[PDB]
Amino acid sequence: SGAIYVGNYRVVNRHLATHNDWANLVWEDSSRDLLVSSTTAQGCDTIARCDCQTGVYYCSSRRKHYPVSFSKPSLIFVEASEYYPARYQSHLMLAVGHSEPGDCGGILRCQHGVVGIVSTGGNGLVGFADVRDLLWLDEE
Ligand SMILES: C[C@H](C(=O)N1CCC[C@H](C(N)=O)C1)c1cn(C)nc1C(F)(F)F
Numbered sequence: 001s002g003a004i005y006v007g008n009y010r011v012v013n014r015h016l017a018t019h020n021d022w023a024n025l026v027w028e029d030s031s032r033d034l035l036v037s038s039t040t041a042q043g044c045d046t047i048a049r050c051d052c053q054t055g056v057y058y059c060s061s062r063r064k065h066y067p068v069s070f071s072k073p074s075l076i077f078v079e080a081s082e083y084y085p086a087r088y089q090s091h092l093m094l095a096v097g098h099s100e101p102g103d104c105g106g107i108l109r110c111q112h113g114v115v116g117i118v119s120t121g122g123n124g125l126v127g128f129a130d131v132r133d134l135l136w137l138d139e140e
């Protein structure tokens with residue numbers, strides 16, 4: 001579990017969005033596994049606006065932050081799960097690292113701010129949904 005809190009927005013994995021998130025919806029994209037809801041209070045996370053490929057992510061299944069190298073956001077085939085059929089997930093970045101069901105929502109960060117959140121796992125790889133292209137999170 002986990003979310004990004006920026007301005008008047010809450011960014012979560014779409015597959016883990018609560019009833020309250022859908023009742024206060026701003027934007028959602030199944031192909032990226034992202035959902036953004038509105039908040040009453042202002043958030044303080046800063047979204048990275050960069051092309052970094054090295055960062056640190058939080059892994060709840062190990063209670064540890066790990067430094068990683070990760071790929072550029074791409075359309076990657078993801079195996080069928082209880083949440084989606086087998087499909088290409090867009091804007092996804094992979095790194096060599098531990099992930100397991102329960103780790104989605106963990107933040108990946110670089111020197112510039114938040115890069116994205118854990119969204120996939122398997123075969124000793126961890127996948128992060130990028131948020132650096134959502135420039136609108138920094139406004140209105
Ligand atoms: C099966 C699950 C996963 O990748 N997904 C389930 C949830 C929906 C995902 C998607 N975005 O499409 C695919 C997974 C397997 N490992 C080892 N770690 C995970 C994870 F970290 F929980 F994501």
Ligand SMILES: [Zn+2]
Pocket residue numbers: 048049050051052110111112113
């Ligand atoms: Zn960066």
